[PDB]
């Protein structure tokens, strides 16, 4: 990793890049989620920006996945209750 130019080419604000990559790295580090790109024993920050460069992560997809994996948890709870 040297430059983050295409990670700004795909998220034009350059400040939303930091929020999206921090949200992604916090999901990968403590929450225990797998990286969507195969790593090379990089740290979670570079893996976050490496997922940004592929395009498969931004704030839209992160909100989609948090709503679907919150509805999945509450659906599992409701089907366990009733």
């Amino acid at each position: 990793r040297v430059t983050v130019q295409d990670a700004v080419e795909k998220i034009g604000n350059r400040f939303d890049l930091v929020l999206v990559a921090a949200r992604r790295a916090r999901q990968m580090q403590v929450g225990g989620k797998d990286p969507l790109v195969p790593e090379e024993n990089d740290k979670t920050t570079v893996i976050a920006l490496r997922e940004i460069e592929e395009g498969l992560i931004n704030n839209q997809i992160l909100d989609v996945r948090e709503r679907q994996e919150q509805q999945e948890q509450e659906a599992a709870e409701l089907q366990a209750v009733t």
């Binding site: 350059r14 400040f15 930091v18 916090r26 580090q29 403590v30």
Partner: protein, 297 residues
């Protein structure tokens, strides 16, 4: 109220390393940057490696042209010293030493020295040559010094090149540097701004008492002052979390930094911000007047 005082004198021997400060006698400073091996040094067509490689570009801007005349006259002095070492290592009688030392001591215009070795009596001349064999010392008074033609005539007494410049080979490639370079002897000083007296590092040390911030200095195991202009330079980027941990977590807030230390040794990487305790000190100092400062909502 003291019983006995014990004083102990440690005697460190500090050698040299990348980071010390050396300088000549003309303002040519410098941090020594790499301690090369012997083989990589540019050598000449005799075999001897040069010891120190300076930078030429400091001369036309920083106008200290005296160091190049000092370099050429030092090479002249060492040329006379090498010729004495050659005439003495071959075990030559005192007549040839007397001849050459007399020629090296006359050598000039109307000067003040005017010595003669005919009143030294064949035993002092051997001891004077024992003291001159590592080079011949040369006095050059301040504004009445040695002109260029005298340096040339003394470089002609030794068998050195007239212009002072020897062609030098390379140590790595083993092939010649184009456009022959200036070598000589410069008298360089080590200054006592060493690098294992300035280098310092702190993860987590002691904390001050009145404002819960780290102590200042090196003897007190302290942290570097993230001053006001650095706060401006981080406002000037968009770095916002870096400045928040740079003045709440890393510095002041005590519960914030113990939460931070637990979170770092558990892999978490997260800050619970809180408030600077020195802002509460500001509230107590303004509040200790007749002024009623608060925090609304």
């Amino acid at each position: 109220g003291v019983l006995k005082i014990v004083k102990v004198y440690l005697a460190v021997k500090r050698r040299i390393q990348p980071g010390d400060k050396m300088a000549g006698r003309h303002g040519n400073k410098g941090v020594i940057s790499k301690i090369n091996p012997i083989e990589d040094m540019p050598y000449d067509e005799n075999g001897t490696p040069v010891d120190i490689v300076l930078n030429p570009l400091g001369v036309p801007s920083r106008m200290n042209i005296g160091q190049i005349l000092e370099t050429h006259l030092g090479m002249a002095a060492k040329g006379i010293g090498d010729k004495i070492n050659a005439m003495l290592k071959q075990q030559q009688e005192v007549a040839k030493l007397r001849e050459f030392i007399q020629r090296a001591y006359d050598l000039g215009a109307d000067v003040r020295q005017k010595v003669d070795l005919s009143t030294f009596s064949d035993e002092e001349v051997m001891r004077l040559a024992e003291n001159l064999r590592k080079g011949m010392p040369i006095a050059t008074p301040v504004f009445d010094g040695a002109k260029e033609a005298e340096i040339k005539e003394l470089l002609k007494l030794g068998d050195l090149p007239t212009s002072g410049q020897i062609r030098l080979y390379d140590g790595r490639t083993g092939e010649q540097f184009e456009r022959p370079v200036t070598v000589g002897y410069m008298y360089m000083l080590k200054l006592n701004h060493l690098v294992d007296d300035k280098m310092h590092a702190r993860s987590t040390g002691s904390y001050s008492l009145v404002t819960q911030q780290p102590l200042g200095g090196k003897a007190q195991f302290g942290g570097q002052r993230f001053g006001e202009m650095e706060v401006w330079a981080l406002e000037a980027y968009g770095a916002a979390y870096t400045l928040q941990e740079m003045l709440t977590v890393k510095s002041d807030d005590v519960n914030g930094r113990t939460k931070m230390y637990k979170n770092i040794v558990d892999g978490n990487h997260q800050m619970e911000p809180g408030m600077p305790e020195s802002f509460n000190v500001l509230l107590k100092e303004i509040r200790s007047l007749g002024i009623n400062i608060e925090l609304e909502d």
